[PDB]
Amino acid sequence: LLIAVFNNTFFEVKSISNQVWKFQRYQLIMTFHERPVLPPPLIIFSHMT
Amino acid sequence: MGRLRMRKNSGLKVILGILLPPSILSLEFKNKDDMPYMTQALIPLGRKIYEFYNAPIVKFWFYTLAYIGYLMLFNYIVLVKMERWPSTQEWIVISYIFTLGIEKMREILMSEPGKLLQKVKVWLQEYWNVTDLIAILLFSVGMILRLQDQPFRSDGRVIYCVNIIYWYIRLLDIFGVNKYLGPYVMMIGKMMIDMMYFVIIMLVVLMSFGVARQAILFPNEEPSWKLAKNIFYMPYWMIYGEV
Amino acid sequence: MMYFVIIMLVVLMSFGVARQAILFPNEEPSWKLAKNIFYMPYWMIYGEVFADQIDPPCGQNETREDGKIIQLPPCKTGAWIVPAIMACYLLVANILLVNLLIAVFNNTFFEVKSISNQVWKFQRYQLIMTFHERPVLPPPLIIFSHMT
Numbered sequence: 541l542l543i544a545v546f547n548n549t550f551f552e553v554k555s556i557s558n559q560v561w562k563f564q565r566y567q568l569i570m571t572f573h574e575r576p577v578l579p580p581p582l583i584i585f586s587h588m589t
Numbered sequence: 590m591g592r593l594r595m596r597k598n599s600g601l602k603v604i605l606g607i608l609l610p611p612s613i614l615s616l617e618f619k620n621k622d623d624m625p626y627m628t629q630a631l632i633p634l635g636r637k638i639y640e641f642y643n644a645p646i647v648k649f650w651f652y653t654l655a656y657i658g659y660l661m662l663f664n665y666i667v668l669v670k671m672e673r674w675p676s677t678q679e680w681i682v683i684s685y686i687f688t689l690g691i692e693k694m695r696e697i698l699m700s701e702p703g704k705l706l707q708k709v710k711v712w713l714q715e716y717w718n719v720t721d722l723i724a725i726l727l728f729s730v731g732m733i734l735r736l737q738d739q740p741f742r743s744d745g746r747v748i749y750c751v752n753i754i755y756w757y758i759r760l761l762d763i764f765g766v767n768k769y770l771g772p773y774v775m776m777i778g779k780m781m782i783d784m785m786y787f788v789i790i791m792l793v794v795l796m797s798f799g800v801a802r803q804a805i806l807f808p809n810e811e812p813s814w815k816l817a818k819n820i821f822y823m824p825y826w827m828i829y830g831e832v
Numbered sequence: 833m834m835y836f837v838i839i840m841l842v843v844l845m846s847f848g849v850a851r852q853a854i855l856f857p858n859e860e861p862s863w864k865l866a867k868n869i870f871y872m873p874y875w876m877i878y879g880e881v882f883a884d885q886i887d888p889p890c891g892q893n894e895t896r897e898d899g900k901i902i903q904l905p906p907c908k909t910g911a912w913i914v915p916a917i918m919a920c921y922l923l924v925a926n927i928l929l930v931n932l933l934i935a936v937f938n939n940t941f942f943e944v945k946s947i948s949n950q951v952w953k954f955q956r957y958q959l960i961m962t963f964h965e966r967p968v969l970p971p972p973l974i975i976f977s978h979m980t
């Protein structure tokens with residue numbers, strides 16, 4: 541029955557998930573644009589900068 | 590892509606640019622005024638280096654490589670035994686946790702509202718930020734317990750293992766960038782609700798059988814918490830091919 | 833299946849590393865740790881939970897088969913977490929990634945079936961011309977046609 545409810549709701553969830561991912565591409569891009577260049581293990585230098 | 594032409598076999602070129610700095614200058618950069626997206630409005634070599642290292646794709650891959658190296662190190666410090674004092678790899682991991690916490694604090698401070706409680710609320714509206722704060726606090730308490738003597742060191746190791754569970758689950762954040770893996774991950778998150786309702790019905794049927802079996806096969810039993818364990822133990826593994 | 837294997841690899845390595853790092857505290861650097869990461873969690877997907885090693889009785893005294901009093905090794909710290917995270921791992925893996933792979937196999941079946949039938953009908957020509965251009969004699973006897 542879990543197989544059945546997974547199968548019969550697959551298409552709507554797949555379309556909504558693809559569209560929500562395409563929407564959240566902007567959030568990912570602006571977040572990574574606002575982050576510092578230096579990685580988390582070396583971000584103390586950019587933080588003191 | 591930032592100020593970079595590329596758009597052909599993505600990912601690999603910026604990975605070789607990151608690992609090999611003399612691979613950066615061999616790439617076709619975009620013009621000075623082709624599409625200048627800005628926030629507030631030897632020299633060519635330095636300009637190319639600055640344009641490469643400020644691109645969001647380069648920053649993403651360089652974050653991803655740092656996270657992968659950190660996860661490999663935290664594997665090395667949980668698998669191998671640890672002495673009274675942390676090793677170099679454990680110090681690098683502790684530094685990673687402390688700097689990631691400082692980064693999340695800076696993200697809290699540099700947000701939209703004025704009042705600090707509003708900033709805290711709009712930052713905790715994301716679930717991944719809440720789990721990040723929880724995991725950083727757990728790493729802090731585990732490391733505090735680990736820097737003491739026995740038996741607190743083993744408790745700190747246990748908390749380290751639970752944290753490694755969390756950081757593997759957080760590797761899906763990096764997987765969220767790929768065009769096929771990200772929709773797959775949030776698709777899984779959608780089917781979790783149906784799984785929960787399934788778990789509710791399984792819990793009812795499982796507890797019925799387990800209570801019946803334990804109360805029939807063991808008539809003379811004292812009040813002990815092992816009965817509750819025996820309710821759940823064998824019926825749960827009977828679902829996965831072990832009768 | 834590859835995307836499914838990627839997600840299974842993440843969850844499998846998480847559980848295996850947690851189990852190995854909890855149940856074996858004092859370990860030297862050896863490649864057997866990496867093997868123990870993958871060994872038992874992978875066979876747990878296919879109906880073998882290794883029921884003797886879920887939660888063995890330890891930290892008590894239990895009589896052996898001959899009746900002699902045998903002292904079990906003491907409890908490892910946090911050893912009770914291994915069955916709980918094993919329960920979570922078995923639930924997530926066997927119930928969610930297998931059924932989700934069933935779902936993505938089912939809902940993409942028709943388009944793939946039509947494209948596969950049409951591509952096979954297209955490649956019939958490639959098969960026919962290839963077998964028309966091959967020699968008569970089989971590969972074990974093709975040296976005669978080759979010297980011909």
Ligand SMILES: CC(C)CCC[C@@H](C)[C@H]1CC[C@H]2[C@@H]3CC=C4C[C@@H](OC(=O)CCC(=O)O)CC[C@]4(C)[C@H]3CC[C@]12C
Nearest residue numbers: 653654655657658659660661662663665676677678861
């Ligand atoms: C950018 C991403 C994709 C990869 C970056 C990670 C690796 C470069 C790191 C992660 C884990 C590291 C290993 C973790 C632990 C050790 C044990 C270490 O040996 C000791 O600590 C004991 C002997 C000594 O003191 O040298 C030698 C380095 C090594 C193999 C490290 C080598 C470098 C590794 C593979």
Ligand SMILES: CC(C)CCC[C@@H](C)[C@H]1CC[C@H]2[C@@H]3CC=C4C[C@@H](OC(=O)CCC(=O)O)CC[C@]4(C)[C@H]3CC[C@]12C
Nearest residue numbers: 579581582654655656657658659660662677678681685
């Ligand atoms: C930025 C992070 C998240 C990943 C970057 C990868 C490398 C820069 C790191 C990962 C593992 C590190 C290694 C882990 C352990 C050791 C053993 C260490 O040996 C000693 O210190 C022995 C002498 C002593 O006991 O003090 C020397 C550094 C080294 C090779 C480290 C060098 C730097 C490595 C390769």
Ligand SMILES: CC(C)CCC[C@@H](C)[C@H]1CC[C@H]2[C@@H]3CC=C4C[C@@H](OC(=O)CCC(=O)O)CC[C@]4(C)[C@H]3CC[C@]12C
Nearest residue numbers: 754758774775776777778779781846847917920921924
């Ligand atoms: C070793 C054992 C303990 C395995 C660990 C099991 C769980 C702690 C993991 C396994 C799979 C994980 C899930 C995989 C995918 C997602 C989607 C992802 O959520 C989103 O991307 C948000 C959008 C959405 O939920 O649709 C992160 C949460 C969630 C439910 C994860 C929650 C934590 C889960 C259940």
Ligand SMILES: CC(C)CCC[C@@H](C)[C@H]1CC[C@H]2[C@@H]3CC=C4C[C@@H](OC(=O)CCC(=O)O)CC[C@]4(C)[C@H]3CC[C@]12C
Nearest residue numbers: 788791792795821822825887888889890912915916919
């Ligand atoms: C309906 C389904 C989806 C969920 C219901 C199953 C779980 C709620 C059960 C199944 C196995 C149970 C575990 C089986 C064994 C143990 C070990 C037990 O610790 C001990 O027995 C101490 C060590 C020892 O005495 O050997 C603590 C409870 C726990 C984690 C149990 C917690 C509850 C679990 C995870």
Ligand SMILES: CC(C)CCC[C@@H](C)[C@H]1CC[C@H]2[C@@H]3CC=C4C[C@@H](OC(=O)CCC(=O)O)CC[C@]4(C)[C@H]3CC[C@]12C
Nearest residue numbers: 792793796797800811812813814815816817818820821
């Ligand atoms: C609707 C569903 C969720 C009902 C499920 C009920 C059971 C799972 C619970 C309800 C009452 C519980 C009992 C309440 C009290 C005790 C006494 C307790 O005894 C002790 O802790 C020893 C006392 C001491 O020496 O201090 C052992 C667990 C036990 C049997 C509990 C076992 C689990 C029980 C049966």
Ligand SMILES: CC(C)CCC[C@@H](C)[C@H]1CC[C@H]2[C@@H]3CC=C4C[C@@H](OC(=O)CCC(=O)O)CC[C@]4(C)[C@H]3CC[C@]12C
Nearest residue numbers: 785786788789792813814815816817818819820821912
């Ligand atoms: C409601 C759904 C969605 C989630 C499932 C929740 C419960 C089914 C779980 C969560 C916490 C679990 C409890 C956590 C800890 C224990 C103590 C544990 O005690 C021992 O094992 C005593 C040690 C021994 O005598 O060996 C017995 C199982 C029990 C009651 C667990 C029974 C199953 C519980 C209630």
Ligand SMILES: CC(C)CCC[C@@H](C)[C@H]1CC[C@H]2[C@@H]3CC=C4C[C@@H](OC(=O)CCC(=O)O)CC[C@]4(C)[C@H]3CC[C@]12C
Nearest residue numbers: 836837838839840841842844845867870871872874875
């Ligand atoms: C996520 C899923 C789809 C894939 C992940 C599982 C595999 C990558 C794992 C599971 C079982 C593993 C194998 C289990 C045992 C061995 C034997 C081992 O060789 C020995 O131990 C030497 C002989 C001996 O000492 O007995 C070498 C690694 C290998 C092949 C392992 C390689 C990696 C395997 C195939």
Ligand SMILES: CC(C)CCC[C@@H](C)[C@H]1CC[C@H]2[C@@H]3CC=C4C[C@@H](OC(=O)CCC(=O)O)CC[C@]4(C)[C@H]3CC[C@]12C
Nearest residue numbers: 657660661662664665668669861862863864865866869
């Ligand atoms: C993001 C995912 C893919 C991370 C997975 C990481 C682990 C599977 C790797 C990363 C670093 C590896 C370790 C790096 C170095 C060593 C030392 C190595 O020691 C020796 O070979 C003995 C040295 C000698 O005597 O020559 C044994 C394997 C081990 C523990 C490795 C085991 C597997 C580890 C933990």
Ligand SMILES: CC(C)CCC[C@@H](C)[C@H]1CC[C@H]2[C@@H]3CC=C4C[C@@H](OC(=O)CCC(=O)O)CC[C@]4(C)[C@H]3CC[C@]12C
Nearest residue numbers: 834835837838841845862863864865866867868869870
């Ligand atoms: C990425 C997906 C699509 C494919 C899966 C790839 C990896 C999960 C596999 C491929 C090669 C495997 C490795 C091949 C060989 C070994 C050596 C093996 O070493 C031993 O067994 C040592 C002998 C012993 O001590 O018994 C341990 C597992 C390991 C690291 C394997 C771990 C799993 C790996 C990394």
